[model samples]
Target: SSQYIMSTKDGKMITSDSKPKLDKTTGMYLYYDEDGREVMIKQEDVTQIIERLEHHH
Candidate 1:
């Protein structure tokens, strides 16, 4: 799988191997960290979501 990078408006970036899950109940984006811990970020705080293709030419 590819890596997912979540960027916040405040210049913070979070990376995960799994695609981020949108928690509508809490209005947050959820993903696992490098340590395999779940992380949640406010939807409004996210500025960009990048997918780093593993097979990029």
Candidate 2:
């Protein structure tokens, strides 16, 4: 299982394989970034990861 990776608007790279968990209370997508560091991304940003198959860090 390969991890998902993408860069932020400021060019900070983020990677995760923890398939978009559902927050019990918030009911939002719990995204994985670094070890133990959780992050939330916008709907627009998600497209970037989907379109990054050929991009390399």
Check candidate 1 and list the clashing pairs.
none
Q: So what's the TM-score on candidate 2?
A: 0.44
Model 2 lDDT tens row, 9-40 = 66666677765554556534457766677777
TM-score of each: 0.87, 0.44
lDDT value for model 2: 0.57
Candidate 1 segments exceeding 4 Å error: none
lDDT of 1 by residue, 11-42 (tens): 98888999999988998998998977898899
Point out the worst 10-residue segment of candidate 1 by lDDT.
Answer: 48-57
Pick out the ten consecutive residues of candidate 2 with the lowest summed lDDT.
46-55
RMSD vs true structure, all candidates: 1.8, 5.9
Global lDDT of each model?
A: 0.90, 0.57
